[PDB]
Amino acid sequence: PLPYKPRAYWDNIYRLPTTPNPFAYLNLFGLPRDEDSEMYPDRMSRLR
Amino acid sequence: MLTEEFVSAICGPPLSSNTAIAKDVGIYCHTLSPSYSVKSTFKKSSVPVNCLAVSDTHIFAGQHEKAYVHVYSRLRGNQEAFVALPERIRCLILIGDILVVGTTEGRLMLWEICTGRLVSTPARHVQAVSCVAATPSHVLTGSDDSDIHVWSLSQLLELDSAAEHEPLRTLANHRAAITALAVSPSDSADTNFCVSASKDKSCIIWNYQTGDALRTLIFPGYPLCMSLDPSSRAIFVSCEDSSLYVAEMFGEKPLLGPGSEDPSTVVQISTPFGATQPDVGPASCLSVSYDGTMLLTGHPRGQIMRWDISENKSPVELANLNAAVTNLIFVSPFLTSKPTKTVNIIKPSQAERAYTFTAQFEPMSFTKSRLDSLLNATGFPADALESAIVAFY
Amino acid sequence: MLTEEFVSAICGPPLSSNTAIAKDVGIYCHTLSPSYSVKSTFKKSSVPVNCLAVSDTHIFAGQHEKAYVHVYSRLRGNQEAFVALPERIRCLILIGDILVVGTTEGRLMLWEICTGRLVSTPARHVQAVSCVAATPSHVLTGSDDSDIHVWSLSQLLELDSAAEHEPLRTLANHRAAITALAVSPSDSADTNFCVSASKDKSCIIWNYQTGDALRTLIFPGYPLCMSLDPSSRAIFVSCEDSSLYVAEMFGEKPLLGPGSEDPSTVVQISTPFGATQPDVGPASCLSVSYDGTMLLTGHPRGQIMRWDISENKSPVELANLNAAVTNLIFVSPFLTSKPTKTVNIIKPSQAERAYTFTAQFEPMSFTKSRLDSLLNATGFPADALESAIVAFY
Amino acid sequence: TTLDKDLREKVVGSLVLLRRKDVIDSVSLLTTLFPILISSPSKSLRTLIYTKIISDLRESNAKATNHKLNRTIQTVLHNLLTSDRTSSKGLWACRI
Amino acid sequence: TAPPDLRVVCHRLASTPVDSLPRLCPLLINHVLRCGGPLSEPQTSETAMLVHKFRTHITSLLTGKSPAGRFTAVCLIKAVIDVGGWESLRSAEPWIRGLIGVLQKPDPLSSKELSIVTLTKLYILLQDYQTLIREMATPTLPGYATACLQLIKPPASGRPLKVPLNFVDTVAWSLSKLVVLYSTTMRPFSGQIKSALRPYIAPTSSDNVVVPQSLKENSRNLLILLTYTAPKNGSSDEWVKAIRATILDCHTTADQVFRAVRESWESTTGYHIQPVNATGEPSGGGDSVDELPPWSGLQAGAERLTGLLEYLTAYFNNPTRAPVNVPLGELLDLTTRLTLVIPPSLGAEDSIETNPAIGRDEKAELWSALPDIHHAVLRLHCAIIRRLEANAIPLATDIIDQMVRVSTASKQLPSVRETAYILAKEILLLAGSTLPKLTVDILIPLIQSSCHDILTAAGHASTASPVSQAASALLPTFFTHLPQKHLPPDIRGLLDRTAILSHNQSAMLASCLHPYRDSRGRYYPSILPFLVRRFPRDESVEVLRSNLVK
Amino acid sequence: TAPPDLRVVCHRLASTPVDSLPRLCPLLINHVLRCGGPLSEPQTSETAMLVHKFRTHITSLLTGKSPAGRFTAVCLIKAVIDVGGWESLRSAEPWIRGLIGVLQKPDPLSSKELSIVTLTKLYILLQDYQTLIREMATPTLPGYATACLQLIKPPASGRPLKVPLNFVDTVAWSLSKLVVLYSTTMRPFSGQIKSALRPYIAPTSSDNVVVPQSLKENSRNLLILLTYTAPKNGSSDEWVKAIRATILDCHTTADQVFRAVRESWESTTGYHIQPVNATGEPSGGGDSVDELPPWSGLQAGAERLTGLLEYLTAYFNNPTRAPVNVPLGELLDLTTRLTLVIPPSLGAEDSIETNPAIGRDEKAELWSALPDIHHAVLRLHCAIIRRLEANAIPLATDIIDQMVRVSTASKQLPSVRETAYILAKEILLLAGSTLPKLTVDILIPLIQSSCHDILTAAGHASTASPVSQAASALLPTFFTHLPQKHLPPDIRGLLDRTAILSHNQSAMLASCLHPYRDSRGRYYPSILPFLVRRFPRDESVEVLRSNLVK
């Protein structure tokens, strides 16, 4: 894990998303995803 | 599965003699997501900047060099009506069921599409009203006379009103013609704001209900158009030097908020988020998607540019419409429940008639009965069932 | 507009031989607003610092190096119980119906005053548990080994859990005995904080659900007692040098927030808003009223002294209790509706029995019927009235 | 629109081939071909889709008059004519 | 493996006598609701055999002689059409005729009402499939309408109707549901429904019949939605004609009610008040079709006017087939006339101008009956606001004046105060943030009355009251949607104290969001310490605590 | 002078015949409610003559022969007592004996019900004033209870009850109100009330009488509140004895219901599962005073067990006179026994080991009867959580395990899912903020089911089902009161997608204020662009815009 950022929680609400391609996990404007097309971001999901 | 759509409007003669692009089409309606396509078309319109308005029944298009508004029914997919206004149209916005028009003479005309009632304010602007923004309680008109006027919607819309309409406040810190106006979606006394861009390379954030200039920003070139992000965190501004800038309200050096500096201090912005090539041209119109991540700009050379703010600094060309793209208006991917539907429009008229409202009443289930519980219940409701059995026996 | 009350405790022998105050009387209940008056007295106790707990039905008071909690019935005026604990009490607090007791040997007990369970924890601390704080979710215990441990209330209060309880986290940045603990009202994992106060001349603001030390504050004397203001803006702190200080967390330079410094960077407070004479001595306990404008301090010579933080006026002495005031607790002027009322307490017993929760079930209108509407309606309800007429005919 | 001309002609021909192989239904092929015929800008694609539609009708009614298919296609043409009088897309219904 | 629920259903239907089957209808209904899979499969497995046997027993009980078995059949048919989907819908064409037969033969009215609800559910669920309308709903529907109109038709002039008024309410509700979807089929029956539902539109005390509110509102909705059956798309024309006729009837009844009072009201639409006879009791109505049944007496005239105002409310509460021309100016003029006739205070009877020849007992009766008319006017305004939303901003100034005048006239009636609070919330949410100083000053007594009611209910001057709930819902609007600069400091202090003592989280949150600035410009202290101490762990209160302080 | 409403009351009472007075009762009551002033004043002005004349008319109508006059008298006494205060309370001395005479006379039962409600309200208002108590309530209360108990008394085994069960419900509700205020006076009647209301505590299908739910809950409430009338302060002892006897009856009934399966449950309280005969249908109950009415049949036993569980729920729904010892361990053991009998999945009849000496029909009946028992257990747990609040934190992990087991057993039942959602919301609001990773893992399928239901109702998988509403009320709790660090990312994505596509404004604000950290510790992007675009001017976004307040 990354160290503590003192101004991350409020900047996450009051600033624009800096992550490239945000809201890709929602899949609101895209096609429905099967198991092969799903997102597995973390090592626990990748492992299982 | 949400599909995002947008309506584009072009003006002027075609730039190149291409037989593929139809000459008569002035309004297009596209689907941005998931695949770009031309969903529908509307013919015979030359619409300047800020003279397009879109609602779920109708498309309003002010005509270039004429005092005309073409109304197109999207439900029927055809041009419903021609509307002739007393004065030339420089700008128009649609708010609810009233169309607000800022003219060349300096007048503001509000036309109710359901009642056919026209209210024409006196010419408090000595020059043409360049831009108009509207919130459900206020109308802000910025004109070429370096003046921004705030009008009350309820005061403008009164039955049997004979007093000449006067704006509540005048916001005139600018020293040049006002190019653009945008408002926050808020309506509170202290939390709302408006950003106004003028030809003096300046954007001013005001609290228009208190008449206080919250912030002053200076750009290398005079701004053409802006848009807030949907979460009100940032301002996207196109400029004359073909550059697109982003200004964040709540950054490390915040323009607004508790950590912000004095309002008299003027913030210089010189770092461009993006730029377009000189063969593309400066962004004539700008719009932000429903998510807020995508950004569509229309340029006078006919191409539409999509800007992925998180992903790509450079824009991506969607299509070339062979004529100067003047307006881009997004449509919400969700459907909104409205108790009345404006199926047909009413032309503006000046006659002594009783106030009539013309709309189709939607089924909103305002009336509820106890038998509706039995009807909509899957199976029979319990207490009603023992009541029926006991009254049977 | 409101009537505020506060409870004061006495430890130690009377300092003055002859006085109007009775020598035996150990607990007082006063009304601060609108005028000072001793509402009631409770007969005998010697309550150390942080050894008083007040509810709407009971007052629990730990004794001085003696493993007895004297329980007084606030709704009857007498001394109900002489509840014995396995170990001597250094501190005690009340959350819901659980009395949380930090001992002299480093142990934590949770006595459920409505069931009789006495949950005991292993001595994770190596010295006496000086201070305790409680949330609806967590329990923080700070001891004299410069250690603060965080415990989870559900895993502490599980019925059949026989595994030895272990704290979730160990907040150990201090280098001396922890004097006091305060807890922010929020319990979310991202907005909560707890502010410690230790003998190392310092106060540390922690995020007690992630363990991060948000802020370090240096005082010219080691803190004795502390209190957050009701709106959680400021930290009133008494020091060894007979002075009262404010650490304002979100003021001109925020201790927490976007404009805050690095958490490694230490903030030094050196400006006292209040001072007391060597005759009065340093304040042995602080508490802040429900409005937050009013503040009370207790001093070892017997003075209860009122500080107005709003007008910054001189402190006003209410009364002299002839002995050291160790505990001052405001009771909320408004009453919170509780479905079960604890008329009597159950002493802790270690024997095989079913889980029995005892209380009086208060009428809270948990059921409804059509006839209750007829009774509570002033007159008769309409539709029931025509129903009655139709049933008559 | 975006695909190569040869590739989209091969896609239409492969769909007609699948209809001959009886993988897909005539109604499904007609409803996936006709809107593209109406709204396609490519003249060659429009002519090829029109020819494939005519061949599909001829092959379907070669055995016996498929009254359901004929009635559905006539209903589609009538709705296309009725939907917009000012539109020029009724010439395809006329030509068919 | 057959499902246990289906096995239990078949066994208990085989074993149970028909006379005790209705007692076990709650068992059978829940079991059929559990039987989801086997009913939805398309038409041999044991599940299919049990499903076929179940449908056989349903048909046998429906066509059997036992009324108890018929009642059980109605319940089972309702459960089947709610659960089994398209197969259950398409296998129901004898079930529809059996359900109509239950209505035709003299079965008990609980069975008849459940058959009506089941048939309505059938005719609504069939609308998803266009073909099943052609086979099922369209042919069998005129017989159902004929049976219903035979049940609710008045048999004779001297003989009262046999079925009770709640059964007539059920029939009117079903036909109101079906005229929207099957207007062409309901077209030949429009004459009978308008004649049958005529007494229940605006019943009076001169009818000597106690008509339920549900029957009244259902009859109003049915006669409004009967415009769907107008030939040649005349729905809008009939709607406009009927609503203008209703406004004219309101004016004519208001003449006979308000004959005691000299009115200074003038009509913008051009309606002129006819002269009225000074002698005799007030009378109105006619025996003809287009007039309502007659009434006699001032109280009966008041109930007729109230019923007509509720009919105008039902106009905005019911939908329309085509766009219609709403006479907003005529309705506004009518409400202005009905609100200008004012109840006098104690000792103001001489101040209010009255007819000399009219009876003083009739004057007292009119002063008693005025607040109900004002209540109906305010409810009509609430319905207009709810239907139009932002299109009622031009009307907003007049409704404010009407509401203030009505509330100041009758601040002693809790129902009138409740309706004033609801209408105030609607108007201030619509156009409240730009009110002028004079309007904010004339809305001050309403603020004081609402705060007094809230404090009385909280005890810091009781229990929960409708007036208290309406004033508590109105309370945050005084902070959010009112100009704080136009408020006096005493009113703002009263609002803050009322919110704190009532523990109204929304009101206290709005008060913290909107600070008060006096003439000098000094910021009055926030009530945030009370809000954080009372509601500490709420996330919006946390955002206020973290943002306002910085 | 006199108020116009009082003048209208006097004039209409003088002119109107007694038969048509029930027609005019709605307006007469409104005028008497308006006349709060003259009736409240102590007792020569015109107000005084009209008040005395009106009271004389009321007394004459009450003592009159006309049943319609008696009905109007009951209505107007209710109005006068409601808005009269101490004066009407002390002048209502003949009115009590008149109302008891109305109950004794062969009057219509609607009039009897209104008389009962008026008498109950009158005694409740008399409870406040101690002189009024011994001058009014003490002599008349035995007569009122005697008359009501004679009306609801079973005449014989062959002779059924003459009064209907709704009237019995009214009597039970009135006596439930009165036993709390007057315990010693109702003490002689305590024995007969139990024998009267014995067959309505847990009715079964073998009684052949349809018992309304209101009568069921009122009989349960009265037989629990009868502990108030215990002599020598034996209220707590009687309450504990009754609840332990109810738990024992639940266990003995569960033996006969669960003869079909062999139970691996072992009691932690002391109960032993006695052997039960494997021949014939199960049966239970008896004719003794301490036993419920007998039943025979597995479904009847299931209904008995469900009714006894609801009777246990009424103990927590009802207040107590004195502190009482709640047997939480015995309740937990009983609920664990009832929830450890999992109904089998499809094609898994050998998954549940059973006694091989029984029938497949009895097995299939038990597998259908089990979800109702589990659902009643879940409402019982909801009542325990609501009553205890933070004192049920020791019970948190057990009820969570039972909820997970029951919901996975009956995931296809909408009612079971709805009550599971309500219980999950209560438990997560109680102690859901510190649940471990294993508990979050076993709560994951409930999250998925709730999100699936919300998305199904939203149309992104129509009217709103109660299951959808219960899941929508639970959706913000999955953010506010759940460890987001123990939640898998797909669950967070499903929750956010459900909130956005269902326009759940509280859920979107909760997701914004409780962000999800990844494995990196970097926060996920906020929903807030969607919240502002869907609800731009709500309090939810007005509190997030608090950084611009100044």
Q: DSSP string covering chain A, please?
A: -----TTSTTHHHHS---SSSTTTTT-SSS----TTTS---SHHHHH-
User: Would you call B376 and F463 a contact, using CB atoms and an 8 Å cutoff?
Assistant: yes
Task: Please answer whether residues C336 and F306 qualify as being in contact, where contact means their C-beta atoms are separated by less than 8 angstroms.
Answer: no
Single-letter amino acid code for the residue at C63: Q
The beta-strand segments (E) located in F227-366 are 283-284, 295-296, 324-327
Sign of the CA dihedral running B319, B322, B326, B329: negative
Question: Which residues of chain A does C263 touch, with a Cβ-Cβ cutoff of 8 Å?
Answer: 4, 6
Q: Residue length, chain F?
A: 550
**3-state SS assignment for residue C159:** coil
Closest to F395 in 3D by CA, of F380, F415, F410, F406: F380
β-pairing verdict for B202-207 and B194-198: antiparallel
Strand partners, B288: B295
CB-nearest to E71 from B168, B356, B392 is B392
**Rounded Cα–Cα distance for residues F308 and F298 (Å):** 15
Closest to E308 in 3D by CA, of E364, E400, E379: E379
Which positions in chain A have a beta carbon within 8 angstroms of at least one beta carbon in chain B?
A: 11, 14-23, 28-32
**Residue C136: closest C-alpha in chain E:** E537
Sign of the CA dihedral running E84, E89, E94, E96: positive
Among B112, B353, B366, B370, the residue to mutate for chain E (most E Cβ within 10 A): B366
**3-state SS assignment for residue E297:** coil
**Rounded Cα–Cα distance for residues B379 and E80 (Å):** 8
Single-letter amino acid code for the residue at E403: M
**Cα E257–Cα E263–Cα E264 angle in degrees, nearest 5:** 160
**3-state SS assignment for residue C131:** strand
**Rounded Cα–Cα distance for residues B15 and E141 (Å):** 63
Q: How far is C225 from chain E (nearest CA, A)?
A: 21
User: Would you call B78 and D41 a contact, using CB atoms and an 8 Å cutoff?
Assistant: no
User: Would you call C212 and A4 a contact, using CB atoms and an 8 Å cutoff?
Assistant: yes
Among E83, E387, E398, E545, the residue to mutate for chain B (most B Cβ within 10 A): E387
Closest to C207 in 3D by CA, of F512, A8, B259, E533: A8
Which positions in chain C have a beta carbon within 8 angstroms of at least one beta carbon in chain A?
A: 190-191, 210, 212, 214, 256-258, 260, 262-263
User: Would you call A6 and C190 a contact, using CB atoms and an 8 Å cutoff?
Assistant: no
Give C374's Cβ-side CA count (13 Å radius): 24
Question: Which residues of chain F does E307 touch, with a Cβ-Cβ cutoff of 8 Å?
Answer: none
User: Would you call F523 and A12 a contact, using CB atoms and an 8 Å cutoff?
Assistant: yes
Task: Please answer whether residues F417 and F474 qualify as being in contact, where contact means their C-beta atoms are separated by less than 8 angstroms.
Answer: no
Question: Which residues of chain C does A15 touch, with a Cβ-Cβ cutoff of 8 Å?
Answer: none
Those chains having 3 or more beta-carbon pairs within 8 angstroms of chain A are: B, C, F
Chain breaks in chain C (C to N over 2.5 A) after: none
Q: Tokens for E192, please give them.
A: 């009978």
User: Would you call F364 and E8 a contact, using CB atoms and an 8 Å cutoff?
Assistant: yes
User: Would you call A9 and F521 a contact, using CB atoms and an 8 Å cutoff?
Assistant: no
**Rounded Cα–Cα distance for residues B201 and B384 (Å):** 71
Q: How far is A32 from chain F (nearest CA, A)?
A: 11
Exposure b/e, C80-98, CB count within 10 A at least 16 = b: bbebebebbbbbbbbbbbb
Using CA atoms, how far residue E327 sits from B113, B168, B197, C107, in Å, is 16, 32, 43, 79
Judge whether D41 is closer than 8 Å to chain B, CB to CB: yes
Q: Please give the DSSP secondary-structure letter assigned to residue B60.
A: E
CA F273 to chain centre: 31
**Rounded Cα–Cα distance for residues E444 and E437 (Å):** 11
β-pairing verdict for C234-239 and C243-248: antiparallel
Task: Please answer whether residues C71 and C58 qualify as being in contact, where contact means their C-beta atoms are separated by less than 8 angstroms.
Answer: yes
**3-state SS assignment for residue C247:** strand
**Rounded Cα–Cα distance for residues C368 and C371 (Å):** 8
CB-nearest to B231 from F210, F463, F529 is F529
* Neighbouring residues of E494: CB distance < 8 A, sequence distance ≥ 6: E447, E448, E451
**Rounded Cα–Cα distance for residues F538 and F532 (Å):** 9
Greatest Cα pair distance, chain F, in angstroms, is 90
Question: Which residues of chain B does D84 touch, with a Cβ-Cβ cutoff of 8 Å?
Answer: 77-78
CB-nearest to B379 from E79, E324, E484 is E79
Question: Which residues of chain E does B190 touch, with a Cβ-Cβ cutoff of 8 Å?
Answer: 514-515
Q: To one decimal place, what's the resolution in Å?
A: 2.9
**Residue E113: closest C-alpha in chain B:** B388
**Rounded Cα–Cα distance for residues F64 and F79 (Å):** 19
β-pairing verdict for B303-308 and B68-73: unpaired
User: Would you call B390 and F210 a contact, using CB atoms and an 8 Å cutoff?
Assistant: yes
Torsion of CA B83, B87, B92, B93, to 10 degrees: -70
Among D1, D43, D85, the residue to mutate for chain B (most B Cβ within 10 A): D1
- Technique used by the depositors: cryo-EM
Single-letter amino acid code for the residue at C94: L
Q: Tokens for D35, please give them.
A: 């809107």
Using CA atoms, how far residue C339 sits from C364, E148, F317, F325, in Å, is 6, 52, 10, 15
Cis amide linkage into residue C258, ω under 30° from 0: no
**Cα F234–Cα F236–Cα F240 angle in degrees, nearest 5:** 120
**Rounded Cα–Cα distance for residues F239 and E170 (Å):** 46
Closest to C192 in 3D by CA, of C177, C176, C178, C210: C210
Q: How far is A8 from chain C (nearest CA, A)?
A: 8
User: Would you call D41 and B20 a contact, using CB atoms and an 8 Å cutoff?
Assistant: yes
β-pairing verdict for B212-218 and B266-268: parallel
Judge whether B20 is closer than 8 Å to chain D, CB to CB: yes
CB-based touch D/A (3+ pairs, under 8 A): no
Q: How far is E368 from chain F (nearest CA, A)?
A: 6
Judge whether F501 is closer than 8 Å to chain E, CB to CB: no
Q: Which helix (H) or strand (E) holds B239?
A: strand B234-239
**Rounded Cα–Cα distance for residues B363 and B245 (Å):** 46
